[PDB]
Amino acid sequence: QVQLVQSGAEVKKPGASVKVSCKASGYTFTGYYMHWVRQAPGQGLEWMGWINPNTGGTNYAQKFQGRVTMTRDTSINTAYMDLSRLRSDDTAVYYCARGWRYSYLDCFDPWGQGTLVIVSSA
Amino acid sequence: AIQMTQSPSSVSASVGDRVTITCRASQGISIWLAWYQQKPGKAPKLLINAASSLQSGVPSRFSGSGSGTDFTLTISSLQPEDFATYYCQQANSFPYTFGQGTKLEI
Amino acid sequence: VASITAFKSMIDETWDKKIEANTCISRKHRNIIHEVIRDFMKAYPKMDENRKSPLGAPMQWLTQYYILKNEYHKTMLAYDDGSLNTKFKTLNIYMITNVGQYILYIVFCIISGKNHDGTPYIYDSEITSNDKNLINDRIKYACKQILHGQLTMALRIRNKFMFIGSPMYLWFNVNGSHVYHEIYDRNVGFHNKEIGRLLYAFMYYLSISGRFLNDLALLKFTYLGESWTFSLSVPEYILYGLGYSVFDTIEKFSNDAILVYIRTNNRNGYDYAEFNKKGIVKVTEDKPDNDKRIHAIRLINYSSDVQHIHFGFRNTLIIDNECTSIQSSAENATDTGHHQDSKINI
């Protein structure tokens, strides 16, 4: 079964950085685009970008430009997302979403588990 | 950014009815629309791709249609497992903007 | 920089090879030319808002105001003391007798935005002109002049497989049928089977399939805002001339299965990826070297008529490396050797 196990919830501070992992299993990690979509509490979905595991290229959204560095390690089929300059509005459930088919940059399936990155000063 | 707007933000329905969800786009997005289903506390699940094609494992009661800036997701007979939040997703122009969401209640 | 180095090496290596009968440009050199054109397009993708074309015409690759601002053009002209630029100034249409001279002249005329006469494609004072007829006539004249000059060289030097296709931005609202019925109406010699066969295949395909096919399109390309819709099989020469690559954005509007050829293998065959679903297709595989990159898409369907079904055969969808084995005519077309091919998306 195609599975996308993510990291646990991280309680970070403003101005820090968060690295959310995404381990893939059940399918060939290269050949399927890995997308990152976050969901703010009480709000909708926001798209951050995709990373091609076979080549290493990326295409980030303009809103998340200069803050997201999507790296991958093909030895563990693991996808990494790093978000710097964490403001108070970055608290969301960060999902990693595989493409719905082989090299299809259209739709996302499955969507993983999610990581509740809580950025607060408490 | 191509904004996606979903009209029936709250659609109450019962088991055995027909529900229609409409997703209008600001600009023409061709046939590239994806419908999702997010039950509370769980990850979203894709149900229809390319606005007219059902994904594998999705029941046949779901049926999508539309082109240009008008789209429609139709449930022929509602089931107790179909009460969730539904999202659109355009892919014609980056970034891939989702919708606000439509929730079904009993 | 790598594309410019490959261009220099190709020009230096092919500067003494004489254009003869049954000569052809190798796959490595074609990929070098393709990469040069793509990098020239990518260096200045969009246009400044101060000088914007209201018609949507791609002025960023046709106007001298944007060519001299392009950094790739400056680097190409000043790579090694302008050695390529110095050789360019002693080349014209009626003096080329070498393959390297042909390649240098055509590519430098394409990337400098100048016709073979010497005039620019679109003048700097006509960027914001709303006259559709003027801009359309300029673009069609540029494309037709490139193709005519290549066919004139083909007639003069009696060559058969010399082909540098006009890029995608020189086909803005340009009817392919008009181009074919204006170039081949005169110079009946062009109709000879020994003169200009690859150009004939390039122009005949674009005369039966338009740029935009509306709801009849089964495939669509996209590269820096330039789109093209295909309903039949797309051979290698069409994608090579237009400038599209299989690693670009490909949009499938039908459930028909396509075979996207990406590279060649060690068993004298071709590796392909098969897609049979609606959606946006972008090949995740790494870009091969310039000697092993192939751009061809074959539609596995029976809806296409038998009149133009010969384009989907293996030996004509991909240009053969051997010059004498290149198949372009409908009568001389074979579909053999699928054992040598392999599947990459298993």
> Domains plus CATH for chain B?
4-105 (2.60.40.10)
3-state SS string for chain C? CHHHHHHHHHHHHCCCCECCCCCECCHHHHHHHHHHHHHHHHHCCCCCCCCCCCCCCCHHHCEHHHHCCCHHHHHHHCCCCCHHHHHHCCCCCCCCCEHHHHHHHHHHHHHCCECCCCCECECHHHCCCCCHHHHHHHHHHHHHHHHHHHHHHHHHHCCCECCCCCCHHHHCCCCHHHHHHHHCCCCHHHHCCCCCHHHHHHHHHHHHCCCCCHHHCCEEEEECCEEEEECCCECHHHHHHHCCCCCCEEEECCCCEEEEEEEECCCCCEEEEEECCCEEECCCCCCCCCCCEEEEEEEECCCCCHHHCHHHCHHHHCCCCCHHHCCCCCCCCCCCCCCCCEECCC
Say which DSSP state B18 is in. Answer: -
Which residue has tokens 């014209």? C92
Residue A44 has its nearest CB partner, among B50, B55, B100, at B100
Separation CA A53–CA A77 (nearest Å): 8
List the determination method. cryo-EM
Residue C286 has its nearest CB partner, among A55, A100, A107, at A55
Decide if C148 contacts C140 (C-beta within 8 A): no
Decide if C295 contacts C278 (C-beta within 8 A): no
Query: C147, C154, C211: which is closest to C182 by C-alpha?
Result: C147
Fold of A3-119: Immunoglobulin-like (2.60.40)
Q: How far is A75 from chain B (nearest CA, A)?
A: 26
As beta bridge partners, residue B29 has: none
Radius of gyration for chain B, computed over Cα atoms and rounded to the nearest angstrom: 13
Separation CA C239–CA C245 (nearest Å): 7
Is B49 in Cβ contact with C278 (below 8 Å)? yes
For chain B, list residues whose CB is within 8 angstroms of any CB belonging to chain C: 30-32, 49-50, 52-53, 91
Separation CA B14–CA B9 (nearest Å): 16
Query: Between chain A and chain B, how many beta carbons pairs sit less than 8 Å apart?
Result: 52
Query: C74, C184, C38, C63: which is closest to C123 by C-alpha?
Result: C63
Q: How far is C317 from chain B (nearest CA, A)?
A: 29
Domain ranges of chain A: 3-119
For chain B, list residues whose CB is within 8 angstroms of any CB belonging to chain A: 32, 34, 43-46, 49-50, 55, 87, 89, 91, 94-101
Residue C277 has its nearest CB partner, among A30, A54, A101, at A101
Residues from chain B contacting residue C251 (CB–CB below 8 Å) = 30, 32
User: Which value in Å is the resolution of this experimental model?
Assistant: 3.2
> Domains plus CATH for chain C?
2-208 (no CATH), 214-343 (2.60.20.10)
Separation CA C75–CA C68 (nearest Å): 11
